[PDB]
Design a protein around this ligand. Structure first.
Ligand SMILES: OC[C@@H]1O/C(=N\O)[C@H](O)[C@H]1O
Length: 502
């Protein structure tokens, strides 16, 4: 009933949108180049969230050809109306705006319903048996009516607002309260200038008048400059079960030199919203890591296991691939290991490698996995990659050398640099466990064989940040295999994946 920590969903979980279905809450994030797309969460208290799945789970729903950290799936919105869940988003690597729907969030969602109105950050609002769509073509918030089942546009598009004057007006959502249509948007861009602004009108099609107190949430001003959280924005308003008001929003945690590697994460703020009043977010339009505020009655949810095993023969919803995966290269063995089949595709090829990953969700963490490389030709490799983008990733691996010898290598890919930090000869018997640790300053790398851990050294975190590497995503930790030899049938088995955050 009192207090929680932010972020409520750590690591790469940007552009949160939430809906209330009775006493249940469901939340979606943008996923960019990753498959499956649009992670889908469930909560009873807005604080604790369980990933129950992903909205885009089949190739027919999600074409990621040539997608990267700056393309693919952008901000999604989730809405619940009359027993139907709708998820509306943009695929910028494909045909643009669309939605999918379902009556059961845990089931397979529909095929895409492609939409006419352009721009990005589409969102839906329902009233009087009608479905209204907003998005942001040419920087203007546009409104139209749609049939959400057929995707047919039923009214002409109208420009309803263009924000307070701040840059990159996006994330529009309409709500109705106290006889006003409230239009909430993001301005300022998704870096340090991020802010949430709100306008209202007696008519859904305007004219909209801005809140004199805008912005309603931002760390861009003097009041936020010292905060370890920056870039607060892309909010979605939601009602508590007790009639209180809340918002989910994105933000990030800054690192030295103004860097962030954990992506934009999902944050929660309380909102005061009196009858006939404008909303005020957490008193002064800021949020904190420790939120000492009343909450809905709290219920803990299932999280990521400290040791993930593959005995069940199914990866949980948390696991993500680069672009559209070659599904036959990920298999589960008789003794319950993850088996990854090699292809020649490296992690720098801008195509889908045999690569599957979990988001890094803590500054201080340790992750590890045993690696059993088999049927390998010379220079075939398998291991763990600390991955931001095809041009920005640190790779720790077991490599097949000549004469049945093997080694552990550590390779840093940064633009035109491909730097071999270490190449260490292995003992011919002994299962190798590869180990990646981190703190806010460095990744540390090592390996364990025959009960002895060996340090392979460290590398700065800043080179994998969004500020350095570009794009819209966060660091992921991936298991991978790449062949580089004539006619290779190499594969590698991974018995578990350990992840523990401090
Ligand atoms: O990518 C175009 C805009 O740039 C931004 N921030 O820098 C906004 O979030 C995008 O809408």
């Amino acid at each position: 009933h009192q207090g929680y920590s932010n972020p409520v969903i750590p690591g790469f979980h940007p552009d949160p949108s939430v809906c209330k279905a009775g006493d249940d809450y469901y939340l979606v994030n943008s996923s960019f180049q990753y498959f499956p797309g649009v992670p889908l969460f469930h909560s009873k208290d807005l604080v604790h969230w369980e990933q129950i799945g992903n909205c885009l789970t089949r190739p027919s729903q999600l074409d990621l050809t040539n997608a990267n950290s700056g393309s693919g799936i952008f901000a999604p919105t989730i809405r619940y109306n009359d027993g139907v869940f709708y998820m509306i988003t943009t695929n910028v690597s494909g045909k643009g705006n669309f939605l999918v729907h379902t009556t059961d969030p845990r089931s397979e969602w529909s095929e895409p319903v492609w939409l006419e109105q352009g721009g990005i950050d589409p969102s839906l609002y329902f009233e009087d048996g009608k479905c209204f769509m907003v998005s942001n073509p040419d920087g203007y918030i546009n409104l139209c009516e749609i049939d959400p089942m057929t995707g047919k546009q039923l009214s002409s598009s109208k420009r309803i607002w263009n924000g307070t004057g701040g840059r990159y007006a996006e994330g529009p959502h309409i709500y109705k309260k106290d006889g006003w249509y409230y239009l909430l948007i993001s301005e300022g861009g998704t870096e340090l200038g991020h802010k949430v602004t709100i306008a209202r009108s007696r008519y859904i099609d305007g004219p909209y008048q801005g809140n004199p107190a805008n912005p309603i949430l931002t760390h861009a001003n003097e009041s936020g400059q010292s905060s370890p959280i920056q870039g607060t924005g892309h909010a979605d308003l939601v009602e508590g079960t007790d009639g209180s008001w809340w918002m989910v929003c994105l933000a990030y945690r800054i690192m030295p030199g103004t860097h962030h590697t954990l992506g934009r994460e999902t944050y929660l703020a309380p909102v005061r919203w009196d009858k006939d009043a404008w909303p005020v977010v957490n008193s002064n339009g800021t949020i904190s890591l420790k939120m000492d505020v009343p909450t809905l009655p709290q219920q803990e949810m299932k999280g990521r296991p400290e040791r993930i095993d593959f005995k069940e023969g199914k990866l949980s919803p948390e696991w993500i691939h680069l672009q559209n995966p070659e599904a036959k290269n990920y298999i589960f063995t008789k003794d319950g290991k993850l088996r990854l089949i090699a292809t020649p595709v490296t992690l720098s090829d801008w195509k889908s490698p045999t690569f599957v990953a979990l988001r890094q969700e803590h500054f201080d963490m340790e992750a590890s996995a045993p690696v059993v490389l088999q049927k390998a030709g010379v220079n075939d490799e398998a291991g763990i990659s600390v991955f931001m983008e095809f041009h920005s990733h640190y790779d720790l691996f077991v490599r097949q050398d000549k004469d049945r010898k093997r080694s552990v290598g550590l390779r840093y890919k940064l633009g035109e640099i491909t730097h071999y930090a270490k190449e260490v000869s292995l003992p011919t018997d002994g299962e190798v466990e590869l180990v990646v640790k981190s703190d806010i300053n460095y990744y540390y790398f090592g390996y364990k064989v025959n009960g002895i851990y060996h340090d392979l050294g460290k590398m700065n975190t800043r080179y994998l940040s969004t500020e350095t590497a570009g794009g819209f995503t966060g660091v992921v930790l991936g298991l991978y295999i790449t062949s580089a030899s004539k006619d290779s049938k190499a594969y590698a088995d991974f018995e578990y994946f350990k992840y523990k955050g401090k």
